[PDB]
Enzyme design. Sequence first.
Site, PDB file in Angstrom:
ATOM      1  CG  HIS A  32      41.801 -29.271 -10.810  1.00  0.00           C
ATOM      2  ND1 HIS A  32      41.921 -30.038 -11.935  1.00  0.00           N
ATOM      3  CD2 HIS A  32      40.517 -29.409 -10.406  1.00  0.00           C
ATOM      4  CE1 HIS A  32      40.733 -30.578 -12.228  1.00  0.00           C
ATOM      5  NE2 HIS A  32      39.863 -30.196 -11.290  1.00  0.00           N
ATOM      6  CD  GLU A  65      44.668 -29.311 -14.459  1.00  0.00           C
ATOM      7  OE1 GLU A  65      45.798 -29.467 -14.998  1.00  0.00           O
ATOM      8  OE2 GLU A  65      44.240 -30.025 -13.515  1.00  0.00           O
ATOM      9  CG  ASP A 114      37.088 -32.243 -12.161  1.00  0.00           C
ATOM     10  OD1 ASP A 114      38.205 -32.801 -11.968  1.00  0.00           O
ATOM     11  OD2 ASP A 114      36.012 -32.641 -11.644  1.00  0.00           O
ATOM     12  CD1 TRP A 115      34.916 -35.753 -11.519  1.00  0.00           C
ATOM     13  CD2 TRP A 115      34.559 -37.143 -13.216  1.00  0.00           C
ATOM     14  NE1 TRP A 115      35.491 -36.945 -11.215  1.00  0.00           N
ATOM     15  CE2 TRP A 115      35.288 -37.833 -12.239  1.00  0.00           C
ATOM     16  CE3 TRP A 115      34.162 -37.829 -14.370  1.00  0.00           C
ATOM     17  CZ2 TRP A 115      35.649 -39.112 -12.371  1.00  0.00           C
ATOM     18  CZ3 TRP A 115      34.571 -39.098 -14.504  1.00  0.00           C
ATOM     19  CH2 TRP A 115      35.289 -39.754 -13.528  1.00  0.00           C
ATOM     20  CG  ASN A 166      33.808 -33.423  -6.958  1.00  0.00           C
ATOM     21  OD1 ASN A 166      32.768 -32.973  -6.474  1.00  0.00           O
ATOM     22  ND2 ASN A 166      34.595 -34.316  -6.405  1.00  0.00           N
TER      23      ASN A 166
HETATM   24 CL   LIG Z   1      36.817 -36.082  -8.373  1.00  0.00          CL
END
Ligand SMILES: [Cl-]
Length: 296
Positions: A270, A130, A106-107, A36
């Site tokens: 990030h 990350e 991330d996701w 995201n």
């Molecule tokens: Cl998020």
Amino acid sequence: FGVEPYGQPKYLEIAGKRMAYIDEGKGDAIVFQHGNPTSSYLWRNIMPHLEGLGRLVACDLIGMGASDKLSPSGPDRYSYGEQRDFLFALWDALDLGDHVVLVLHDWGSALGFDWANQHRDRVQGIAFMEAIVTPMTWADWPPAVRGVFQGFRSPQGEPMALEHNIFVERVLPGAILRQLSDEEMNHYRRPFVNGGEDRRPTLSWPRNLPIDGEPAEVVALVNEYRSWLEETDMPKLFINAEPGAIITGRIRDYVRSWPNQTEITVPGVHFVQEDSPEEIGAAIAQFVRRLRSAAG
Ligand SMILES: [Cl-]
């Protein structure tokens, strides 16, 4: 830092919706999964380093990138489970084979770690950065964005994301050390130009983060896959970032304990791909060449 997307967009109809992806090259799959509020665009300066090392695949999550929006959209849509339903169906349709290397952020890391846990005999190695690796507390979360994320995880989240596009406009640039060019920013904005429900995935995602025990189903998911990551001898490439964002402190110490793991540390917050793509791409290429060697 290249601005053009990598490869040519391709589409398949999955569960009623067109999903977009990149698929270039021959061989064992190297599968790059964004989170995201990004898309396969995130990997554009990383993928070239893997040319000749495998079949390079990078999918756009439902509602993201060039993939379709769900309709009707609302607060019940784009949960982790729905995201998984679409992505796992796309990965099945692509016929990835049984020697997959995952490259996760991330996701994308939750989805890919879950997939690998469910398909352990099909995964050769995992590179991640990350990533979501353990249930969190607010103390684990970057101080600068505690308030914002709490806001998303409340009734203020709709105006924040849907009306003001805060994840795209604020969170994304705020977690890149360099300043993106306008052109690059405008590729990230593209899926989200329309105010309203087109921005829902960017809100549903933070509402799924496993923070202080909630939501309980995502805490459970992460506890299941991380129990496997801790004990598996599957090869791993941990790309650590300094200062980093979500893998810092105790979570960084935890990840560092995992077996059979090659580590790098590069500059970044990030969205590390935007600050250290050469280091990251080289590391992934080196990792994959070692896996190919070891496989004869
Ligand atoms: Cl998020």
